[PDB]
């Protein structure tokens, strides 16, 4: 019942809806009227509610105001949200019944063990004199478009091609990530990509074992897909939404193999710029990592860099990239919002 | 109802003697929970030169966790320890690693005593799918036909690791009773956390001893119970002859360095595919190869090496026991006859004959490591005759 779905209005048995956050002047004329009137036919039913940390208190008004049910269901991994110690949540949903231990899922249970990796790299200094020269958001794009990041990025692809298991990389924005999908060209998406071929990419990824590598953008974690993989690499770390990023990895990372050993088999990677906002943010980020506490390691060096035929081994090639960055604008340096 | 009833379980067990001294007797009951079965030995008759047969159920029962992340992980890890502690105690023997997987039986490692070969096999046995159902009939088929060609002067025992599942095999294994009862081969299984009556009838029709796995500690106990060479059925054999005493060779005896390496495809010995320089020598082939206190393939007799294996059980039978008293006869200056200390946890350990005072750490050190009271020494050998 959302985004012109209108699937079985007449006769409601068991329904899926979406939080009618409307409050508008004839937003959906008959459609939200049906959402109003078939709520009345729903009587009470059940309030299956995913992750109400996403719900604002202004929408928690419309939780009880619109929906006046007699049994609720809060499916919320978050315990405490939005720094709002004024309004609690048992007045909304009653008791908060059960939480499941990580230990009895990650050590005794199907949930895999993530190795979280905030990996920072020594950059080339010809990204940084410019950075400190320029107090303007092109400076953000400087450390972003780094072959020192790419040398890490190039690395773990072939390092985990040798285990023949699924890997996924999440960048920040497209046109830097695009050249990764140009240089070592992989499956990839962006914002306006056609979904029917995005689904083929899921078919090419989640079914086909020949290519365990894939690129995603801001949209794919959020608006199109729940990826189902084993090894995650991240580039984006700028905004202070700790959990929102941490629940992306918490959803995607599945069991790597049927591994006999008791080791860590799910894998997280982050690419961190030294001496940067990224260095600074990661300090609070790894603070948030140890705030919940998981298998975490900072590595800086590779397992033999020139073991692989590293592209951008010459800095002149990196200077070729640098002049693209000198030709670049702010437009490659903004997310979906 | 149950929200109270879930915590009627907790509330009393949390509670104890209050006021002062709280959470104290709860620790005392945990010490009172301890002290399980000690030895209950004292046997005679049989147990010599076993010819064991590891039989492994490889099934879908392994996928249950129940003690470890895999039931093989419970199994396989301590088998290596069971291998090593066997070769510790019983080097006069050898073991057939045979694996059942997918309704067949693979004799994985042959009946032999080379530990590294057996252990790396277990290290190879790590990444086993254990696909398919158990078939004991294929396992007994290998067990027959191999041990059929062994002498009747051989101890004939089989150790089956079964995962308590359905014994999925045809061809009248109930009639394999009279097959193997006549064949004087013993078969011992222990069930993984459950029981198979037919297999329980099998072992009670065997004379092999059946058990059920309780816990990982308990898993070790029955291994340890089956470390010792058991008194199997009467009328097996008396003797076993042409026990070859070897020589060590130094290859520097008279002709110094007349041979660059003592393995060049013509020398008497040189059995295994590797270079050697002369370390050993058997009587009958006059076989010189890598040193092995077992047997050979050309003389085909037993490469006995007496200080090792004719010494191991040679004191593993003739034991006696101690006694315990809580009393205070203060022998010494409140000391021990062994380690010479005192704690007095009322276990003053007195020998049966020489009657000397010991502690747990002196009793355990005898009853696990020394295997005899040395207080009998100075007391036996001086009037001995």
């Amino acid at each position: 019942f959302t985004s012109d779905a209108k699937d079985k209005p007449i006769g409601c048995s068991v329904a899926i809806s979406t939080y009618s956050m409307l409050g508008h002047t004839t937003k959906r004329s008959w459609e939200a009227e049906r959402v109003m009137e078939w709520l009345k036919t729903q009587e009470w039913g059940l309030m299956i509610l995913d992750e109400v940390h996403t719900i604002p208190a202004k929408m928690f008004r419309r939780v009880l105001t619109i929906v006046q049910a007699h049994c609720k269901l809060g499916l919320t991994a978050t315990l405490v949200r939005e720094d709002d110690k004024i309004v609690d949540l048992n007045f909304l949903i009653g008791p908060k019944l059960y939480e499941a231990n990580w230990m009895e899922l990650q050590n005794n249970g199907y949930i895999a063990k993530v190795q979280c990796a905030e990996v920072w790299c020594p950059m080339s200094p010809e990204f940084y004199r410019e950075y400190v020269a320029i107090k303007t958001k092109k400076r953000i794009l400087l450390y972003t478009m780094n072959p020192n990041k790419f040398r890490a990025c190039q690395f773990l692809i072939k390092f985990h091609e040798r285990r023949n298991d699924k890997i996924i990389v999440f960048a920040d924005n497209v046109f830097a990530l695009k050249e990764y999908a140009i240089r070592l060209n992989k499956p990839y998406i962006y914002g306006p990509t056609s979904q029917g071929e995005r689904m083929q990419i899921l078919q090419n990824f989640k079914h086909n074992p020949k290519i365990n590598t894939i690129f995603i953008s801001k949209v794919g974690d959020t608006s199109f897909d729940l990826p189902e993989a084993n090894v995650l690499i991240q580039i984006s770390s700028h905004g202070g939404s700790r959990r929102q990023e941490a629940q992306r990895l918490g959803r995607v990372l599945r069991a790597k193999k049927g591994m006999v050993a008791e080791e860590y088999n799910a894998f997280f990677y982050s690419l961190v710029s030294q001496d940067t906002q990224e260095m600074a943010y990661s300090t609070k980020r790894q603070r948030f990592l140890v705030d919940q506490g998981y298998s975490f390691k900072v590595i800086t060096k590779l397992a033999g860099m020139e073991e692989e035929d590293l592209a951008f081994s010459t800095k002149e090639e990196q200077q070729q990239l640098l002049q693209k960055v000198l030709a670049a604008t702010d437009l490659d340096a903004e997310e979906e919002v | 109802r149950w929200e109270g009833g879930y915590e009627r379980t907790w509330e009393i067990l949390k509670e104890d003697e209050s006021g002062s001294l709280k959470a104290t007797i709860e620790d005392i009951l945990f010490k009172a929970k301890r002290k399980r079965v000690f030895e209950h030995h004292g046997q005679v008759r049989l147990g010599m030169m076993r010819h064991l047969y590891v039989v492994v159920d490889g099934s879908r029962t392994m996928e249950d966790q129940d003690l470890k992340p895999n039931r093989l992980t419970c199994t396989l890890k301590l088998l290596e320890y069971f291998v090593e502690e066997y070769f510790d105690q019983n080097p006069i023997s050898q073991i057939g690693i045979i694996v059942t997987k997918s309704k067949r039986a693979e004799k994985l490692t042959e009946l032999s005593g080379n530990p590294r070969k057996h252990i790396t096999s277990l290290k190879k046995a790590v990444d086993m799918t254990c696909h398919g159902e158990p078939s004991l009939y294929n396992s007994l088929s290998i067990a027959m036909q191999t041990l059929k060609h062994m002498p009747g002067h051989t101890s004939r025992e089989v150790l089956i690791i079964f995962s308590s599942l359905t014994t999925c095999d045809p061809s009248n294994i109930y009639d394999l009773i009279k097959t193997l009862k006549a064949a004087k081969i013993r078969v011992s299984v222990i069930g993984l956390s459950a029981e198979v009556r037919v297999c329980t009838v099998l072992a009670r029709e065997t004379g092999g001893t059946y058990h059920v796995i309780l816990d990982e500690s308990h898993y070790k106990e029955l291994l340890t119970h089956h470390v010792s060479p058991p008194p199997a059925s009467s009328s097996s054999e008396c003797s076993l002859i042409r026990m070859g005493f070897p020589q060590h060779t130094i290859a520097s005896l008279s002709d110094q360095d007349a041979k660059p390496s003592f393995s060049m495809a013509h020398l008497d010995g040189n059995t295994e595919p590797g270079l050697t320089l002369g370390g050993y020598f058997c009587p009958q082939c006059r076989a010189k190869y890598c040193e092995l206190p077992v047997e050979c393939k050309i003389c085909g007799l037993t490469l006995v090496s007496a200080p090792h294996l004719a010494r191991s059980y040679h004191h593993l039978f003739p034991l006696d026991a101690f006694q315990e008293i809580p009393l205070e006869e203060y022998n010494g200056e409140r000391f021990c006859y062994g380690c010479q200390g005192e704690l007095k946890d009322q276990h003053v350990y007195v020998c049966a004959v020489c009657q000397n005072v010991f502690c747990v750490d002196c009793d355990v050190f005898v009853h696990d490591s020394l295997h005899c009271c040395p207080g009998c020494i100075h007391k036996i050998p001086a009037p001995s005759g």
Binding site: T283, R287, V290, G293, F296, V298 | -
Partner: protein, 453 residues
Amino acid sequence: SRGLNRVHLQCRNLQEFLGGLSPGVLDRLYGHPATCLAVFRELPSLAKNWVMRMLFLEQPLPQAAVALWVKKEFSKAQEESTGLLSGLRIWHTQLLPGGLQGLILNPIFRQNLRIALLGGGKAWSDDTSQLGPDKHARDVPSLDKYAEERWEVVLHFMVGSPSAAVSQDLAQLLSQAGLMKSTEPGEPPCITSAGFQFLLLDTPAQLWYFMLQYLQTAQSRGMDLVEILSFLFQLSFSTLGKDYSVEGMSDSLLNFLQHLREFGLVFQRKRKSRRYYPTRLAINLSSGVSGAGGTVHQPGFIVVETNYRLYAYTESELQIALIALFSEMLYRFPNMVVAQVTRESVQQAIASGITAQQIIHFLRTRAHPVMLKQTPVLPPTITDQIRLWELERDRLRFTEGVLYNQFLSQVDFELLLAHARELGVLVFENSAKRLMVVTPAGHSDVKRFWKRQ
């Protein structure tokens, strides 16, 4: 850069001192109390057997027999064990006893050592004044509290006490030491940089170093005496003495003793006399190495799980002071669990430099019975964190120098390369731009050489 020798120096204490002075002055270092001092502050196992023959070797054994005592395995370790033992000046290389150099020890030490091996009722053994338990007037664990609290009134008054230290002239040596200092008005007993490092240290051998440097400030008494007396302290405890330190007195032996209760390691009664007392402190000086006995107090286990400092045990205020330098800013109550900072405790080494092992030492010294049932790997990654944190701020290596640029030739530059490499006054060269990083101390010898040609 920063000094890093003032922390450990545990073989050079008996080498760089001893080899920095005369053989006849270290001949004084063969007092019979100084015999145990030789064997233990060196820790080779290899020279520790090359001694063992000499009690039975009056004869100078030939050099090749022990030069070939050990074959192909660890010839360097034999060689590394050799010249240092020779660098003790305890050996004599004979000329041609039988035809070739056959080495031998100094016999006067062999005289002194064998009395400390078998027999001898001599002056340190007995007969004059050594030791005396007559009747128990005072007990050791009570005096162990003294052996704790004097460390406090040392170590707290380093940081600064709301209480006060006793009337010592030692602060005018510790301000002289560069540990402490004081500006001229009122003389504030602060810390310069190095007591802070010694706050991060925990052994008495630094005190011992300034007590070896005690006579160095224009004082002329027995340096021979005090280092004998440094051993003569290292006798465990359990001895009051019928004023046996006055029956075995000397001038500095009694006066500097007044300071050993300032240093706390002796305990003196009325009139600073009538007895003497060695403290259980008299065995960790003997090594300086960590030691299982060096536990001071037994608080408990720690961990640093989730690198969040993770521990409790309300301890004394000196440990609270030991982390008052090391963890404030989200302190909590009655368990001492100040949270973690990867910047502030990182900034709390800037006044020290790197405390790399001194973390790891105070890792096994925060709550002391932690190694009882814990992992061997106590920091899993957390060492490397501390390392990378220490490897973050150290962005500079301070080194002065003289650089030779725009040289008139290119091959005569390689001469001056070979000239400076002969001198060893170069630090670095660039041949591609005709550059040489040369020490400015060895500048003058090339400055003299260039002006001659």
